[PDB]
From a paper:
The mitochondrial ATP synthase is a membrane protein complex that generates most of the ATP in eukaryotic cells. The translocation of protons through the membrane-bound Fo part, mediated by subunit a, drives the rotation of a membrane-embedded c-ring and the attached central stalk, which together form the rotor. The torque of the rotor against the stator subunits induces conformational changes in the (αβ)3 headpiece, thereby triggering catalysis. To reveal how the mitochondrial ATP synthase is modulated by lipids and organised into a dimer shaping discoid cristae in Euglenozoan mitochondria, we determined the structure of the ATP synthase dimer from E. gracilis.
Symmetry expansion of the pseudo-C2-symmetric dimer particles was used to classify individual F1/c-ring monomers into rotational states 1, 2 and 3 and resolve structures at 3.0- to 3.9 Å resolution. Using masked refinement, maps of the membrane region, the rotor and the peripheral stalk tip were refined to 2.8 and 3.3 and 3.8 Å resolution, respectively, enabling the construction of atomic models. The C-terminal helix of euglenozoa-specific ATPEG1 (H5EG1) extends 50 Å from the membrane region into the lumen, where it interacts with the N-terminal extensions of subunit c, which together form a ten-stranded β-barrel protruding ~20 Å into the lumen. The N-terminal residues of subunit c (A24, I25) form a hydrophobic interface with hydrophobic residues (M148, M152, L155, I159, L163) of the amphipathic ATPEG1 helix. The position of the lumenal H5EG1 on the c-ring β-barrel remains largely unchanged in all three rotational states, suggesting a mechanism of transient rotor-stator interaction during c-ring rotation. The extensions of OSCP and subunit γ are conserved in Kinetoplastida, suggesting that the observed interaction is a structural feature of euglenozoan ATP synthases. Together, the matrix-exposed subunit γ/OSCP interactions and lumenal ATPEG1/c-ring contacts pin the F1/c-ring-complex to the stator, likely providing additional stability.
Residue numbers in the entry:
A (entry chain H): 17 to 176
B (entry chain W), C (entry chain X), D (entry chain O), E (entry chain P), F (entry chain Q), G (entry chain V), ...: 24 to 104
L (entry chain G): 3 to 278
M (entry chain 0): 141 to 167
N (entry chain I): 2 to 67
Amino acid sequence: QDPRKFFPDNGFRFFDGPEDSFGDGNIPAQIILTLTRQDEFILKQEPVAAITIRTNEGEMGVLAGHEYTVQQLAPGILEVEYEGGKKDQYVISGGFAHVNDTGVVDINTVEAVPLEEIDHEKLAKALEEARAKSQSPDEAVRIQGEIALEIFEPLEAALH
Amino acid sequence: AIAYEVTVNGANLIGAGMAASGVGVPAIGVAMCFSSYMLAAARQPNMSAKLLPYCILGFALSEALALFTLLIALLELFVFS
Amino acid sequence: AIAYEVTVNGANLIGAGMAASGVGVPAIGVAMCFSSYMLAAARQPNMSAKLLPYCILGFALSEALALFTLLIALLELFVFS
Amino acid sequence: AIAYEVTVNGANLIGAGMAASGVGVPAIGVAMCFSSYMLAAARQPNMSAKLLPYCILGFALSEALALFTLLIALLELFVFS
Amino acid sequence: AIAYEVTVNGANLIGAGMAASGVGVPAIGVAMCFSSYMLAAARQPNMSAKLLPYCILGFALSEALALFTLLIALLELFVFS
Amino acid sequence: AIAYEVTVNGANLIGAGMAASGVGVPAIGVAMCFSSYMLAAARQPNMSAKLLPYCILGFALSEALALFTLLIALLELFVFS
Amino acid sequence: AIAYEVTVNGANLIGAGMAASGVGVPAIGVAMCFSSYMLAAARQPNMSAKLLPYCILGFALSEALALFTLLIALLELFVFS
Amino acid sequence: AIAYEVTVNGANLIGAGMAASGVGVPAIGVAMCFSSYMLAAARQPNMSAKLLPYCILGFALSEALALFTLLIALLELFVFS
Amino acid sequence: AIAYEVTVNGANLIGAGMAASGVGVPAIGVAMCFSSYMLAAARQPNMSAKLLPYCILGFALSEALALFTLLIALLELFVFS
Amino acid sequence: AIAYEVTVNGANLIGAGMAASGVGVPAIGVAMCFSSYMLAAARQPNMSAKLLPYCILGFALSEALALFTLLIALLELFVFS
Amino acid sequence: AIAYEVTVNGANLIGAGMAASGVGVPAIGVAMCFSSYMLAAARQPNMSAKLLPYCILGFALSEALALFTLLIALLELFVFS
Amino acid sequence: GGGTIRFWREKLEGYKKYHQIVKTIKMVTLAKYRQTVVRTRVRDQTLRYTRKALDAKTQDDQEVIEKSECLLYVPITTNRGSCGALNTNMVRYLQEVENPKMTIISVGKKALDAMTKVFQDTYRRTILNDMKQAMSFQFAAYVLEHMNTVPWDRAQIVYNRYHGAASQKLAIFNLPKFEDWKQKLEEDSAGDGKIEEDGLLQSLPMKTALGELEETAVEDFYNFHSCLAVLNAVSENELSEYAARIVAVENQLGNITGLMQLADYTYNKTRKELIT
Amino acid sequence: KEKEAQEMAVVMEKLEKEIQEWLKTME
Amino acid sequence: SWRDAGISYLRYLSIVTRCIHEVQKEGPLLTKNVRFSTIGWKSLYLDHGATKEYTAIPAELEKIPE
């Protein structure tokens, strides 16, 4: 018998993850952001001045040097403020935000699309449908309407 | 038995101190009612305006309890001989 | 044994201080009962209407204790000689 | 030795001040219970009806303590002389 | 030297006030127990049955310290004439 | 220098009032301990049995301190005249 | 009922002390308000300017209750003879 | 002037009622230390062997203060006249 | 009515204690303020400087209250006969 | 005017009670330090060696005050009359 | 009117008890300072160095308040009568 | 040689039709590969942090078979063949790894014919994705829901890594169970940070901040990151399928031409002989 | 009451003559 | 809510993603992204000689596994 011709690599080792160090000095003034939908990113280690996220407990803001905190992201939007005062918003579908003390943010979602690519006409027709779903007595429709509303109401608030 | 009615004219003042020991406590009730706004406004700024009535309401009732304590402590200084 | 019955009129007043000092404490109740509703409403705005009754209830049933503490400090100056 | 029994009538009232100070402290007990209900219902609305009994229970027991304190006050202002 | 034994009859009625100040401090305890049960069962409802004893068991003891504080006042007013 | 040895047979009682004011404060400790047990076991049910000994051991000495305070208060009525 | 009106001059002063003790209590509210501002602005730097008016207000009024409690304690030494 | 020395044989007791008020307030410290141990071991179960030394420490020394307070409330009744 | 003006010189020396009882409460405020600064700077160091002024402010004014309290306890000893 | 210098030989034994009422208040402010150590160690045990210097330092300087709150109560029974 | 100037010497000694009672409160501050520096130093060890100055500052000031309190309690036994 | 010559003619025409059919397959495959190579620009970024949660030192197999009670092996296979040596090498790895405690839920049609003939009773079922729609997060959620029918202690997601057009090698994701991952997470959060294996990252702050997170959210963390791992596996095997089929089709065309010159030599030789 | 206060009005008048008489000698 | 109803976190995220795809604008992005929500998948188990579907874990998100 051929002594184990096959020796497959470990797929995790291909990703150059960050080495979480304890720190010995100064604090960064801009964070290194990574935002990843399903597999493809949208931003690869971009320099950012700030980032504002939404969670279940409530909204949150992330400047550089922020403490280590891994945490949910509630379905809502996500604001990214670059160094030049500009901004960029992103509707997401849940995920996780991993913040390091080294100014290295890794946000990993299931979807991420800007506000520019969302319209109010195609949303005002979905909102009342979600509401009528929440009013139809049945678990298989009420929860679907609740979830759709959980995502839509932030967009109704932010598009205005 | 013997009977001695005495009118102490200094105890119109000691009490005015004790009541004033309870005028500063509702300050907590004020700050707790503004602090909880800031936090609630830092977690959800969209909810920054429809919470604010309850902030002022709790501040007002706490300040009103302090004002009643003070109305005693002044009613216990000037109107009594 | 001799018996001296003394009526100290000033003690009409000292206790009213001692009671007034316990009029500001319920503010920490009231404020908390509001400081919750903000934070709760920051945690789930869709429950903001289902929770205001259980806020006003503690508000009122703390101000009740405050008013029952103040009824003593007003039923001790003017009704007692 | 000599024997001077003395009856100080005003002590019918000073203590009623002190006892009146312990009526406002259970207000924190009521608020700490209603606020907890608010926060819990915010964190889990499905449980909002499963926790309401304990809210009323804790409030009632705290209010009963405050009421015993108020009994020692009002039963010390009037019936004693 | 001289030896004046005086028997004051108002200490029957002041200390009972002082003790009556301490009947409320167990209320915040009862409330903290019930509030903790609320928050815990919100965190994990499946434990709400394994936790209800230590809430109940935490009231009855924390309540007893009030009753004894209420014993003294009702053992210092009525029997100590 | 004229020596006046006064023996006040009422001060036996005021003390037992003041001490009673401290009998309720360990109640919040007892409830703190049970509350912490609840929140811990909610955070981790598997650690429900390992921590319960300390939940018993905190009550068992907070209550002991309150019992010593009550011993002082009751031993200031029935043994001293 | 023999009538002895007495003026205890030292009661000008003791009561002021009883008021001075209530001057430091609002400091905890001041600190609570500024602490809330800090923690909120950490939760959201972008809101750091929209919360500051709700601090200075909730501070100053909470500080006002420290002035009255002091004014009495100065309205009770210098003017009261 | 005229030198009137007085010895009040009741002050043996009144102050013992003050000291016994400060014997309960370390109970909240005991309960705080145990509560913190529970919450830590719920936060890090395998650290529950490395923290318990500090708990047992902060429980004892806190308690020691109470004992010292209690010592006065025993050193002020039975040995002083 | 018979008029006895009595001046208790020793009352220069008890209110000063009652004031000193409340000089340490603002220490809690200062500590709360610096502690909140530490926690916020932990959460976001870049806001630290932007939050450092308010901390200092929340220290001084709080502290200033204590100073006024302390001032009373120096104005109650050295100037009042 | 008439001049009575009165020496109360029992006051020695009352201030000790009021002083010992504060020996237990540093206890909560000691157990907070060890509680914080436990919580922090849970959050990061790697740092659990670098922190206990800032626990010990928060014990002695938070226990020594009790000593200076207690030594008075031992400097006020045994050296003074 | 009649004029009785009385000097109670024992008032050198009851007010120091109250001040010494107030010496223990700032401990709750000092710990709350260190208790924060631990937690912060857990959340952000890289900022463990830029927080210790604020820790020592808050501790020193919370201690200086107690130092002035104890200075009252000590300046009221030795120089005054 | 009438039968002979008509045989060579039919052979020639059959190969000339088979050539253009295979060329059509190649064109379709290029049109599906040039869409999905876009992933390469946008790769190696989403599991930048997942590994710190789930990665670990290389645990030997002979000890893990003892430590556990039911393993799981999820091979990502293809819905249609002509890939080359992807499916076969996966099966060779699995029958090299064969142990008394294994359970196989695969992904593809070609894990349904081979495995059941190789792994009779361990092999449970498969999952299928007709590739009309790009693969989603919820496909990997479906895969996780099928994985969680087994009370497994470890899951080895086998897949094919596209290192390049010429290199489609193997790769694995060794996912742990939840109730073991959590215990190891606590045990590693307590002790100091000393990496025990080169190439492994230090993640002690990660594992403390996760301790800061409640139970439901830690379960969600585990599920989310396991799903992202599964998703990258599916995407990589898709790209590798479309990158190996072109190779296994080019060599098919080479072999077909090698057959066709033989046919066209024997045809013309037989024809010339029949004329002579 | 009127009979109670009439003599009591003299009771205190008697008391104030004496008190001045005891004090103004020492005073 | 959806938790005690029995659906998992992943189904919830996928539902939210479907909603975002429902509302978002027409263009190359919707053309790209609806592919990440539309359902095509199955599970099949080979019986003695033939295939059969494992109908216990459904693809549609309105339903619950059983």
